[PDB]
Design a protein around this ligand. Structure first.
Ligand SMILES: [Mg+2]
Ligand SMILES: [Mg+2]
Ligand SMILES: [Mg+2]
Ligand SMILES: [Mg+2]
Ligand SMILES: [Zn+2]
Lengths: 148, 38, 216, 147, 98, 130, 122
RNA sequence: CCCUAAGCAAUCACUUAGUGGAAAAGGAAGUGAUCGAGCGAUGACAACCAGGAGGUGGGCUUGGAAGCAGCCAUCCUUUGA
């Protein structure tokens, strides 16, 4: 939780592998789990928690502005992607090997087809516009998803 | 003239025109809307 | 008594096309890729009876354009809850009809990124066959409901409900009327109006929809 | 007759008390319009009625400083919040009901609202449904009979 | 026979236009220390009238329209008071000079 | 679907119709137009209807009112006289032109007993009474 | 519309199936915008029983009359060439009012003469 | 093709950027192929012409807010609209 920025409160280990992220898909296809509209990724890659929260804030602000009164709060968002992998880094003027560096942030590994956000309680046009607004905060190619 | 990578129509009087192999946005109403891709 | 009751939705005549298929000589990723390069979706026609030893299976290929058009026009869930006529010919535009069957599309695999069709599965449904079908829900009367007039929001908990259905009277959708719903109370799966020959597979105490309290 | 209409202004003046300065001041002074003949013709019309009736006038202003104005009986808003109750409509109409009126006051106002100069061929059911719409606009509730 | 016509308007205090030699030369006064002289091309002729109005005639539509464009480009209209050279049917949209 | 309206409106309009004509409604204000429609409905029994030219005739095709097809050009209002009293129905529009001074809006063409009479021709039929 | 004309005389047989252009021209020229541009103009309508073809015959401000084939051409085409001929007569006018001879004439060989670009010079 | 030994090789398509012969998000929508969707002689699109109304200045807010600062309602009528 922790309000806006999403990462684990604690982890079993502090320092993780780099891993490989350029591959991976959903082998059975993807369907929305909670909402009527959604954003899924088209590529596989890494998303920082700051980028996920920027996209969520863009969707929330667009729903807050485009709708007013009683339907302003009736738009609901689900965040299906969670940055649970810590990344580390080393400072400048430091030579190569004296152990792993200190953790610097959190990332989420995304596969092809993986649903990132889900939306309900809004119109289709507002869902499309919020999906367009959220895609500019993300370094991966995304697509608008509709329940059918 | 506004020079940017993402040129847009920003009103109903904005037309896209291609001149000398370059994309321009011309506007009969608002001269602030005049753009060149680059 | 194996007919759709009056006042209940029936499958639409507009989407009652015949799905055209040609036989397929093999299975695997190689021939599937070669078929998708030729504009066809690999498929299979089988039946319930001998699930071991295959189901009297016939391997076929269907056109990508027809499958894509049907899935786009109907919707994903509406495609999977509606019977179709499947015609199998020796080649595209021939006359040697190999099989003409009334089958339910049991599953369809769309690509996770591009949503192109990769596989369509048809199960033979002659009259008197009982199939487990996920029927999509259509919610009407939300503009009449007192709960949503007061500014409360709709929590749609389920979009499809699983039913054991005789093949004759599989509903294309179930209309859920929300008009007598004010703030707080909910509908369960037992509140859905169906044919008496349809059986709920999941328990009747499963919430379908709930009008939750709007923020004062 | 042939004049291209320069302007058309609506105007609210209580019945018979048209002293041309507070409501008939800048409203006609903005468009060169004369005051004396307009006021004498207006008070020569709304003399048959009780004073302090918030009567509405539409002035068709012209370029030769000529007048062909139409005087209209007051709004159905005033007719409904005088024949129902308080003179304060709802803050959030359709959420906070203020006063309730059945059908008969609606019928009498519809009898009044047919006497306008351009409503001779409108039927009373039409005006009645319109009055229900105006009532719903204000938070005023509508019923069958109050007891 | 000259079929094509295009009419220019001169707006501005002290601004003048004057044709010289059977329409083969145009002279403008545009607030400078000198006169601006334009040589009228072949198959184009120029005239000036008692409305501070320039007229461009001729038999080639391209040359007449281009010469009218050149004359307008000598002093295109400015946005604050509408002074300069403009087409007769051209609408200039003004803005408030603070 | 908007043509289903016109088909139904003229179907109800032709149930007791004896007479179809047209009025050129150029320049008429909305208040003038509604006033003429209301005058024609209480002083006479005739219903006025503005519609497409191509819909009205298509609901007058294979019908008694079949040969009107040439007189279906221009901004037209269709005056379905649903009574028998044609003289009063024609006299009230003459009174309308005299009183309101609208001489650009004329009666153009008519069909009675399957005969297209000119505006020269259906004037003595206003002159005769009953 | 009516800024070059002084009479619009339109006649058509009422029953003939080619009356569309004439009645549409009556729609164009009897408008509120049209008669506030020339209240001095006359619009004459002649309804006739005989079978002459429909004819729109206008005359201009300088006495020039130019008839039209109303049964074969649309009212927008009639309006377009009325605008063109009226503009041409207005151009010819201030030409004669300012002492210039009309029509202005040039020899038809200066097209083949080379024309260098017009550079304004002091 | 020449430099450079051997084809201005053959057939059907595509591009006109010297792309080919370096470079992403994003923009623009050139030019083809296939499948759809919607509207269309019941006359569509583009163009020209004429209207675009009445309850009503909806209620609140409010120095004023009258279709159009802001909040709530957003119905009805006559209509070709
Ligand atoms: Mg295998
Ligand atoms: Mg060699
Ligand atoms: Mg290169
Ligand atoms: Mg590139
Ligand atoms: Zn613009």
């Amino acid at each position: 939780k922790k309000g806006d920025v999403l990462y684990p409160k604690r982890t079993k280990y502090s320092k993780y592998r780099k891993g490989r992220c350029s591959r991976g898909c959903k082998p059975d296809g993807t369907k929305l789990g909670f909402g009527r509209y959604g954003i899924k990724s088209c590529k596989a890659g890494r998303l920082s928690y700051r980028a996920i929260e920027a996209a969520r804030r863009a969707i929330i602000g667009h729903f807050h502005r485009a709708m007013s009164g009683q339907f302003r709060r009736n738009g609901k968002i689900w965040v299906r992607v969670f940055a649970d992998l810590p990344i580390t880094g080393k400072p400048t003027e430091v030579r190569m090997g004296r152990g792993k560096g200190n953790p610097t942030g959190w990332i989420a590994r995304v596969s092809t087809g993986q649903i990132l956000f889900e939306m309900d309680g809004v119109s289709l046009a507002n869902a499309r516009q919020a999906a367009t607004l959220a895609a500019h905060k993300l370094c991966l190619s995304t697509k608008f998803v509709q329940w059918s | 003239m506004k020079v940017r990578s993402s040129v847009k129509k920003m009103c109903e009087f904005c037309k896209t025109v291609k001149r000398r192999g370059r994309v321009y946005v011309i506007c009969s109403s608002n001269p602030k809307h005049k753009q060149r891709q680059g | 008594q194996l007919e759709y009751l009056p006042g209940f939705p029936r499958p639409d005549a507009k989407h009652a096309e015949t799905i055209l298929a040609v036989p397929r000589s093999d299975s695997g990723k190689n021939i599937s890729a070669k078929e998708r390069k030729a504009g066809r979706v690999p498929s299979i026609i089988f039946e319930q009876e001998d699930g071991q030893h295959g189901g009297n299976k016939r391997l076929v290929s269907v056109q990508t354009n027809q499958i894509r058009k049907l899935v786009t026009h109907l919707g994903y869930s509406f495609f999977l809850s509606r019977l179709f006529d499947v015609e199998v010919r020796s080649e595209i535009g021939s006359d040697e009809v190999i099989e003409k069957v009334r089958a339910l599309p049991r599953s369809i695999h769309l690509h996770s990124g591009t949503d192109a069709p990769l596989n369509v599965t048809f199960i033979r449904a002659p009259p008197g066959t009982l199939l487990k079908v996920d029927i999509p829900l259509v919610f009407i009367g939300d503009d009449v409901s007192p709960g949503l007039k007061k500014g409360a929001s709709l929590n749609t908990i389920k979009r499809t409900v699983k039913f054991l259905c005789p093949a004759e009277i599989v509903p294309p959708y179930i209309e859920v009327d929300l008009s007598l719903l004010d703030v707080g109370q909910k509908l369960v799966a037992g509140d859905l109006k169906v044919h008496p020959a349809l059986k709920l597979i999941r328990p009747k105490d499963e919430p379908i929809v709930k009008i939750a309290g709007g923020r004062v | 007759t042939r004049r291209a209409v320069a302007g058309t202004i609506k105007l609210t003046v209580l019945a018979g008390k048209a002293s041309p300065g507070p409501p008939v001041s800048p409203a006609l002074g903005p468009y060169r319009l004369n005051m004396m003949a307009f006021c004498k013709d207006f008070n020569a019309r709304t003399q048959k009625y009780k004073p302090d009736t918030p009567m509405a006038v539409k002035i068709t202003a012209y370029m030769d400083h000529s007048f062909e104005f139409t005087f209209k009986s007051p709004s159905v808003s005033w007719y409904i919040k005088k024949a129902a109750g308080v003179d304060k409509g709802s803050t959030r109409p359709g959420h906070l009901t203020v006063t309730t009126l059945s059908v008969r006051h609606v019928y009498e106002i519809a009898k009044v609202k047919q006497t306008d100069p351009f409503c001779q061929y409108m039927p009373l059911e039409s005006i009645c449904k319109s009055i229900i719409g105006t009532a719903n606009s204000m938070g005023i509730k509508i019923v069958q009979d109050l007891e | 026979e000259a079929k094509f016509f295009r009419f220019l308007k001169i707006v501005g205090v002290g601004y003048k236009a004057r044709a010289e030699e059977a329409g083969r030369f145009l002279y403008l006064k545009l607030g400078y220390s000198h006169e601006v002289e334009l040589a009228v091309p072949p198959a184009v002729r120029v005239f000036c009238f008692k409305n501070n109005v320039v007229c461009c005639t001729g038999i080639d539509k391209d040359r007449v329209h281009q010469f009218a464009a050149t004359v307008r480009s000598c002093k295109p209209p400015e946005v604050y008071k509408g002074k300069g050279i403009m087409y007769v049917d051209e609408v200039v949209k003004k803005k408030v000079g603070k | 679907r908007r043509a289903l309206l016109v088909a139904g409106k003229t179907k109800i309009n032709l149930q007791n119709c004896h007479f179809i004509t047209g009025i050129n409604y150029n320049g008429l204000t909305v208040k003038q137009l509604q006033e003429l429609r209301g005058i024609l409905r209480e002083n006479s029994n005739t219903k006025l209807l503005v519609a497409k030219n191509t819909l009205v005739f298509k609901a007058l095709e294979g019908t008694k009112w079949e040969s009107l097809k040439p007189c279906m050009k221009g901004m037209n209002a269709w005056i379905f006289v649903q009574t028998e009293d044609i003289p009063a129905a024609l006299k009230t529009f003459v009174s309308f032109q005299k009183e309101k001074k609208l001489f650009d809006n004329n009666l153009g063409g008519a069909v009675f007993e399957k005969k297209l009479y000119g505006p020269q021709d259906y004037k003595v039929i206003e002159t005769m009474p009953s | 519309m009516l800024k070059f004309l002084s009479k619009v005389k339109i006649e058509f047989n009422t029953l003939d199936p080619r009356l569309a252009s004439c009645v549409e021209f009556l729609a164009q020229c009897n408008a509120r915008k049209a008669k506030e541009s020339n209240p001095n103009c006359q619009v004459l309508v002649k309804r006739r029983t005989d079978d002459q073809p429909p004819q729109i015959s206008v005359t201009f401000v300088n006495g020039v009359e130019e008839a039209f084939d109303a049964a074969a051409t649309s009212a927008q085409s009639i309006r377009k060439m009325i605008l063109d001929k009226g503009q041409y007569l207005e151009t010819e006018q201030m030409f004669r009012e300012a002492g210039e001879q009309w029509p202005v004439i040039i020899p038809e060989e200066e097209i083949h003469q080379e024309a260098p670009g017009v550079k304004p010079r002091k």
